[PDB]
Amino acid sequence: SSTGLTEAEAKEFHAVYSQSAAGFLAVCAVAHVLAWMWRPFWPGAEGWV
Amino acid sequence: SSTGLTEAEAKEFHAVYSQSAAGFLAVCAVAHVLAWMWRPFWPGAEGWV
Amino acid sequence: SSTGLTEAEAKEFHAVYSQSAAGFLAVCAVAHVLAWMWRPFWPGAEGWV
Amino acid sequence: SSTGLTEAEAKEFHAVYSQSAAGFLAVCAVAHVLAWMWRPFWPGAEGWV
Amino acid sequence: SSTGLTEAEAKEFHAVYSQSAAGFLAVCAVAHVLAWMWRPFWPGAEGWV
Amino acid sequence: SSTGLTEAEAKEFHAVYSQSAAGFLAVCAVAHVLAWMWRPFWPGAEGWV
Amino acid sequence: SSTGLTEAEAKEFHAVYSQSAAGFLAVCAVAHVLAWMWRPFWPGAEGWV
Amino acid sequence: SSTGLTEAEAKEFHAVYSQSAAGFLAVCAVAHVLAWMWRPFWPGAEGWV
Amino acid sequence: SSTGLTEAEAKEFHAVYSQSAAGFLAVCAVAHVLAWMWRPFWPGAEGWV
Amino acid sequence: SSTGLTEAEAKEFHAVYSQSAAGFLAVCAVAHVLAWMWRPFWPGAEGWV
Amino acid sequence: SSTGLTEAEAKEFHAVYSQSAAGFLAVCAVAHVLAWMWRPFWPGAEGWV
Amino acid sequence: SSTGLTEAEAKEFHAVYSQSAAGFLAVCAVAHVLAWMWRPFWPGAEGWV
Amino acid sequence: SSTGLTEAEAKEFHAVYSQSAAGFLAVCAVAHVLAWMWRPFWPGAEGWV
Amino acid sequence: SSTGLTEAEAKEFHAVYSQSAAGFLAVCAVAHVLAWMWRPFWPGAEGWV
Amino acid sequence: MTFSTHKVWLMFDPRSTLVALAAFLVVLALLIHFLCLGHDRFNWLEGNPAATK
Amino acid sequence: MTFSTHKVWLMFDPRSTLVALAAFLVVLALLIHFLCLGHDRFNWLEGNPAATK
Amino acid sequence: MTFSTHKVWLMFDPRSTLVALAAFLVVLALLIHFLCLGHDRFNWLEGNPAATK
Amino acid sequence: MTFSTHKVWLMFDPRSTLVALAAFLVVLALLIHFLCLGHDRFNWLEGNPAATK
Amino acid sequence: MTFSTHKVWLMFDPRSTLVALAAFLVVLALLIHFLCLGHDRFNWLEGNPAATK
Amino acid sequence: MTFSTHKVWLMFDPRSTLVALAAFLVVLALLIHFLCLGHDRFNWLEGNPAATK
Amino acid sequence: MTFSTHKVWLMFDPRSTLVALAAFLVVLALLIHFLCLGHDRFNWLEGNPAATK
Amino acid sequence: MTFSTHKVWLMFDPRSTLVALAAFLVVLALLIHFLCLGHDRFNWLEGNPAATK
Amino acid sequence: MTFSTHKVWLMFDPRSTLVALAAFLVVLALLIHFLCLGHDRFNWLEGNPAATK
Amino acid sequence: MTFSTHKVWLMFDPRSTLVALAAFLVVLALLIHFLCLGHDRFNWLEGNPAATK
Amino acid sequence: MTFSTHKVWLMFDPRSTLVALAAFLVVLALLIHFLCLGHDRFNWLEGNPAATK
Amino acid sequence: MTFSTHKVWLMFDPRSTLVALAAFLVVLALLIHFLCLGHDRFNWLEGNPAATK
Amino acid sequence: MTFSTHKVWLMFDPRSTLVALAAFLVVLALLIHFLCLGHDRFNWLEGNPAATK
Amino acid sequence: MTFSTHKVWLMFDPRSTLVALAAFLVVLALLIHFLCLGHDRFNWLEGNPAATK
Ligand code: BCL
Ligand code: BCL
Ligand code: BCL
Ligand code: BCL
Ligand code: BCL
Ligand code: BCL
Ligand code: BCL
Ligand code: BCL
Ligand code: BCL
């Protein structure tokens, strides 16, 4: 369309892009779980005590 | 019209855009419920006491 | 005329615009009533006492 | 003339403009009456005492 | 002349302009009378006492 | 000449200009007399005492 | 010459200019005499005592 | 495609690039293990005590 | 020559210029004599005592 | 290719470049060994004591 | 030559230039003699005492 | 090649350049030996004591 | 050559240039001898005592 | 070559340049000997004592 | 300008005049509100007592 | 503008008018929110007691 | 300029003259109001007692 | 804009509108998070006790 | 320049001369008013007693 | 964008979109890491004890 | 210039010369008045006693 | 990118991509080293004792 | 330039030379007057007694 | 880049690559030397005793 | 340049050389006068006693 | 570059390379001399005693 | 340059060389005079006693 | 460059090389003289005693 790609080329690029984005989000989720196990980042009513 | 799209293309784009906007607002609503359950953000007459 | 629109297109755009503006103003009015119930914002002769 | 409008077009635009201006001035007059009833804004010889 | 108007157009424009200027000056005169009645603005030899 | 005006136009413009300048100077003279009668503005040897 | 004026035009312009300059200098001289009669502006050996 | 390279050229460049990236990451991983054995960089609840 | 004037024109311009410069210098000499009679401006060995 | 060089010229340039880079790295390694023997730069738990 | 002048014009200009420069230097020399007779400006070993 | 030189001109220029660089390095080496003999610039464990 | 002068013109310019430079240097040398007799400008081991 | 000079012209220019450079270096060497004789500029272990 | 002077729009472009008038009115309203906020008696948000003297 | 003035879009371009109106409304909302934040009684995040005097 | 000098608009363009005069008058009005606000007696918002000495 | 106004994309370009909306939403989210971080109660990283008064 | 020198308008353009004269006269009037305001005796708004010494 | 919206690359150029996304993600990651470094509890390099209150 | 040097205007353009002379005279008058105002004896607005020593 | 996505270089120019990647990696390495130097425990040149608390 | 060097105006343009000379003379006169004003003895406005030592 | 990748010069221009590499290496060497000079233990010219703690 | 080097004006333009020389001589004279004014002994306006030590 | 790599001048222009090398060498020499002057032990002009600790 | 090197003017333009040499010599003379003025012993205007130590 | 390398002027323009060399040598000489003046021992104008320790 406005880009030079076709639907097939867009489909395969989107497959690779989706796999890459899912991997990035999975690594970020694992990183956040690790960070929480290090120091939880949502304080209770009394703060960081 | 002035964008080059047809009504059918505009309709399918609007369907995707509407779904995405509804999902974003739903996530924001859940986030605001969570933030309120963490610390409510409308103070009473005596403030944060 | 000077915008390229016809009266028919101007009329339907104005219908959508009028509905959107009325909805925005209704939400703003509800928000102002809520903000007043939270904390009224017109002080009496003695101020915020 | 120098704007491209006709005298009839100028007449109808001026009718709408005059109505809108009168409405704006009326709302401002009501707002000024309300503001005066809240806190009058012309002090006497002793000031705001 | 140098402007695109003719004498007939200039005369009627000047009629409207003269009426508007006279009205503006009358309002300003009334406003200055009111301001003087509020607080006179030419001090005597002893100042504002 | 170098302005495009003729002597006839220059004479009547100068008539209006001269009347307006004389009126401005007369108003300024009256204003200066009034300001002097308010507070004279040439001090004597001892100053503003 | 290099200004486009004729000697006849230059002569009358210079007549008007000379009269205007002489009048300006005469007014300035009267003003300086008046200022001196107000406060002389050349101090003696002891200054303004 | 849009770079002028062929798929075979892209394939050999990617082979070299992948080997270089893997080597860089392996050196970085060894470096991070060494840095951790020098001074671990995730503090416990008591900090660096 | 390089200015477009003639030696005849240069001679009369120089006559006027020389008269004007001599007058300016004469006025300056008189002014300096007056200034010296007011307050001499070359101090002796002890200064302005 | 995109540089104008051929594989043979690229090969001999890479031979010289590789020799020079290896020499630079060897000199840097010797310099680092010397600097360590001067003052080691990885502190222990007690620091520079 | 490169200025457009001839040697005859250059010599005639140089005569006036040399006379003017000699006069300027003579006035400067008389001025420096006068300034020295006012206050000599080369201090001895003890300074201005 | 890309500089316009031939291999013979490049070779003779490189002969001169190599001689000049070797002389510069020899002078720098002698200067560094002299500077070390003046004040050695690698401190021991106790510093400059 | 690259300046447009001939050797004959260069020689006769250089004669005057050499004379002027020698005169300037001679005046500077006399001035330096005079300045040294005023106050020598190379301090001994004890400074300006 | 790239400057437009011939080798014969380069030879004589380099002869003059070399003589001038040698004279400059000789004057600088004599000046440095003189400066050393005034105040030597390489301090011993105790500094300028 | 009055109700009867409809011919002013043969001289002033209605669109540009409307835009300029809106800009001027918004700026004036902001300035007046800020002036009220800048004084003790009329800063309704600060809520000082009305008698500031 | 009212409900019956649909011909204003024969004078104002709907797209540019919508963009300018959105920009103005966002700026106005930000200004008013910041004004509330800048005063003790109406700064809901600071949570002062309502009676500031 | 008086009531009888209608021919002034054959020399000055009415629209640009009106715009320039409106700008000058607004700036002058703002200046005079600000000068009143800058003095104790005539700052009606501050409301000092009229006798200020 | 609603679920039924699909014709808005015949006057607004989807790509530029999407980019502008993403930029606006990101800037708004950053501003709101920074406002939360700028107050004691809602700076979750600083972790003050919820009752700041 | 007097009542009899109408030919000065064959040399000076009346419109530009009027504009420049108005600008100069307004600037001079503002300067003199500001000078009066800058001194104790002649600042009518401040209203000092006339005998400032 | 979801797993099924592959047609979004007919509207957005994949190379420029990838470059802009990489820039945005790197900047956001740096911002969040700097915010963590800016608070006592979550500056892992500084290593304050977790209970900062 | 004198009363007899009328041919000076065959060299200097009368209109530009008049404008430059007016500008110079106004600037000089302002400078001299400001110098009078900058000294105690001759600041007529300040009205110091004449004997300032 | 992965080991199998060689067709990424049909979209990204290898030379400019390599230059940009090298610049980014060098800047990131400098930033991280400077962050280590900016903290007491991890400034190996300063050589503080590891237990900074 | 003397009384006999009338030919100097074949080299220097009389109008530009006169303008530059007038500018230089005005600037020099102002400088000398300001220097006199800058010293106690010769500031005639300030009127210090002549014996300043 | 390794000993076997001579084809990298069919992509990178040797002259510009050499110039950029030399500039980067010189800047990196200067930075590291300045970092050594910026710390007590490794400033060889200042010559502090090695045990700075 | 001497009394006999009249051919120097076949190389230097007399008008530009004269203007440059006038500017240089004026600037030098001002600099020297200012240096005299900058020292106690030779500031003839200040009129210090000649023996400043 | 070594004694045997004479073909380096078929790639680098000898004149520009020489000028750039001279500039770099002069700047480096100045920098190193200034660094010596910036330390007590190696500022030969200041001449501190060699044992600065 | 020596007495016998007249061919230097076939390479250097005499007029521009003379101007540059005059500028350099004037700047050098000013610098040296100011250096003398900046030191107690050699400031002849200040007239300190020669033995400054 | 040595005595035998006369062919260096087929590569370097003698006039521009001479000008650049003169500029560099003058700047270097000024720098070295200023460095000497910047230290007590070698400021011959200041004339400190040679033993500054
Ligand atoms: C989320 C899916 C739909 C959507 C569904 C609806 C529905 C249903 C309604 C609106 C209404 C409105 N929408 Mg909408 N709206 C969408 C996207 C937008 C976008 C945008 C650029 O993305 C904008 C600027 C708007 C703007 C607006 C307001 C001008 C208008 C008035 C009420 C209001 O919310 O005022 C306050 C303005 C704001 C708070 C900012 C506006 C931004 C958000 C996105 C507005 C959506 C609000 C809407 C009520 C949410 C309901 C959707 C639910 C998932 C069912 N919408 C998409 C296309 N929208 C209402 C209306 O027309 O009034 C009569 C209405 O009933
Ligand atoms: C909300 C749906 C309609 C609308 C419905 C009406 C109705 C009904 C009226 C007006 C009137 C006015 N409208 Mg409206 N108005 C709309 C959008 C606008 C826009 C705009 C750029 O979108 C502007 C500048 C205006 C401007 C104006 C004023 C100039 C005018 C004077 C009274 C007033 O409110 O002054 C104060 C100015 C402000 C407070 C600034 C804000 C302007 C707001 C947006 C206008 C809405 C005010 C209106 C009274 C609300 C009633 C609508 C209800 C939903 C039923 N309207 C849309 C098209 N409008 C009145 C009129 O013509 O006077 C005789 C009137 O009776
Ligand atoms: C509101 C509907 C009408 C309107 C109705 C009238 C009527 C009726 C009169 C005027 C008069 C005037 N109008 Mg009007 N006027 C309108 C819009 C304007 C606009 C504008 C750009 O919108 C401007 C600059 C003016 C300017 C002016 C003044 C020059 C003039 C003198 C009064 C005055 O100075 O009061 C001080 C106020 C100002 C300087 C601010 C000016 C702006 C406002 C909008 C002026 C309106 C005047 C006043 C409120 C009259 C409205 C009463 C109606 C019954 C609602 N009008 C619209 C078109 N106007 C009077 C006149 O001509 O004198 C002989 C007069 O009798
Ligand atoms: C007011 C109506 C007339 C006018 C009527 C006269 C008359 C009559 C005389 C002058 C004279 C002069 N006018 Mg006039 N003058 C006018 C407008 C101007 C304007 C202008 C741009 O508008 C300028 C620059 C001048 C300038 C001048 C002076 C150069 C000149 C010398 C005396 C003087 O006042 O010096 C000081 C300069 C000033 C104080 C500032 C500007 C001068 C003011 C504007 C003119 C007033 C001067 C005059 C004495 C006023 C008397 C007019 C009465 C109403 C009868 N006039 C208009 C056209 N003018 C006199 C003359 O030529 O001397 C022989 C003279 O007799
Ligand atoms: C010195 C002579 C050779 C060279 C010989 C080798 C050999 C052998 C190897 C590499 C490897 C690598 N080289 Mg190499 N390398 C050279 C010049 C370069 C240049 C350059 C612009 O000059 C760059 C950017 C690189 C980059 C790289 C890395 C991307 C890659 C991964 C390991 C690594 O060191 O990561 C860390 C990145 C850095 C430390 C940044 C510094 C870059 C330096 C110059 C990398 C060269 C170090 C290399 C390991 C030396 C090995 C010892 C040799 C026997 C002398 N080389 C020259 C052409 N290079 C390795 C590889 O491909 O992994 C599978 C590998 O086995
Ligand atoms: C006012 C009427 C006449 C005029 C009448 C005369 C007469 C008569 C004489 C001069 C003389 C001179 N005039 Mg004249 N002069 C006029 C306008 C000018 C203007 C100008 C741009 O307007 C300038 C720059 C001058 C400049 C000068 C001097 C260069 C010259 C030298 C004496 C002097 O005053 O030095 C000091 C310079 C100043 C104080 C500043 C210069 C500006 C003023 C305007 C000088 C003119 C003052 C003049 C002497 C006063 C006499 C006029 C009386 C009304 C009779 N005149 C007009 C055209 N002028 C004299 C002369 O030529 O010397 C032999 C002389 O006798
Ligand atoms: C003064 C007369 C000759 C000259 C005579 C010689 C002789 C003889 C030799 C050199 C050597 C060298 N010359 Mg040489 N040199 C000249 C002018 C220059 C110029 C210049 C732009 O004017 C430069 C940049 C150089 C540069 C250089 C060095 C790169 C080179 C290495 C040793 C060295 O001194 O390093 C240190 C660099 C410096 C101290 C700064 C460089 C500037 C000065 C002018 C270098 C000349 C020093 C030279 C040794 C003095 C001896 C000449 C005596 C009068 C006999 N020369 C002129 C043309 N030069 C030597 C060589 O080639 O090594 C194998 C060598 O034997
Ligand atoms: C003033 C009358 C003559 C003149 C008559 C002479 C005579 C006679 C001699 C010189 C000499 C010199 N002149 Mg000459 N000189 C003139 C104008 C100039 C101008 C100029 C642009 O106006 C310049 C830059 C010079 C420059 C110079 C020197 C470069 C040169 C060397 C000695 C010296 O004074 O060094 C120091 C540099 C300075 C002090 C800077 C100031 C330059 C001044 C203007 C030089 C004039 C000095 C001269 C001796 C005075 C003669 C006039 C007397 C009143 C009779 N002259 C005019 C044309 N000049 C001498 C010479 O050639 O050496 C062998 C020499 O014998
Ligand atoms: C004064 C009349 C002659 C002149 C007569 C001589 C004579 C004779 C000699 C030189 C020599 C030199 N001249 Mg010479 N020189 C002149 C003008 C110049 C100009 C110039 C732009 O005008 C420059 C840059 C130079 C430069 C130089 C040096 C590069 C060169 C080396 C010795 C030296 O003085 O180093 C130090 C550099 C300086 C102090 C900077 C100032 C340069 C001054 C102006 C040069 C005059 C040198 C000296 C004072 C004159 C007598 C020299 C003695 C016989 C030693 N000359 C004119 C053309 N020059 C000598 C030489 O070639 O060495 C083998 C040499 O024997």
UniProtKB/TrEMBL annotation, chains A, B, C, D, E, F, G, H, I, J, K, L, M, N:
Annotated compartments: Cell inner membrane
Topology relative to the membrane: Single-pass type II membrane protein
Domain Antenna complex alpha/beta subunit: 8-42
GO molecular function per UniProt: bacteriochlorophyll binding; metal ion binding
Keywords: Antenna complex, Bacteriochlorophyll, Cell membrane, Chlorophyll, Chromophore, Light-harvesting polypeptide, Magnesium, Membrane, Metal-binding, Transmembrane, Transmembrane helix
Primary subcellular site in the record, as a coarse category: membrane
Transmembrane segments annotated in the record for this chain: 21-38
UniProt record, GO biological process: photosynthesis, light reaction
Gene Ontology, cellular component aspect: plasma membrane; plasma membrane light-harvesting complex
Residues noted as binding bacteriochlorophyll a in the record, renumbered to the chain: 32, 42
Main function: Antenna complexes are light-harvesting systems, which transfer the excitation energy to the reaction centers.
Family classification: Belongs to the antenna complex beta subunit family.
Annotated protein name in UniProt: Beta subunit of light-harvesting 1 complex
Organism the protein comes from: Roseospirillum parvum
Organism lineage string: Bacteria, Pseudomonadati, Pseudomonadota, Alphaproteobacteria, Rhodospirillales
Encoding gene (name): pufB
Residue numbers of the full-length protein present here: 9 to 57 of 68
UniProtKB/TrEMBL annotation, chains O, P, Q, R, S, T, U, V, W, X, Y, Z, AA, AB:
Domain Antenna complex alpha/beta subunit: 6-45
Binding site for bacteriochlorophyll a 1: 1
Record's keyword terms, sorted: Antenna complex, Bacteriochlorophyll, Cell membrane, Chlorophyll, Chromophore, Light-harvesting polypeptide, Magnesium, Membrane, Metal-binding, Transmembrane, Transmembrane helix
Single GO MF descriptor: bacteriochlorophyll binding
Membrane topology note: Single-pass type II membrane protein
Residues involved in bacteriochlorophyll a 3 binding: 33, 44
GO annotation, biological process: photosynthesis, light reaction
Residues that coordinate or bind bacteriochlorophyll a 2: 1-2
Record field: transmembrane: 18-37
Cellular component per GO, a single term: plasma membrane light-harvesting complex
Compartment(s) of residence: Cell inner membrane
Its job: Antenna complexes are light-harvesting systems, which transfer the excitation energy to the reaction centers.
Protein's name in the database: Alpha subunit of light-harvesting 1 complex
Natural source organism: Roseospirillum parvum
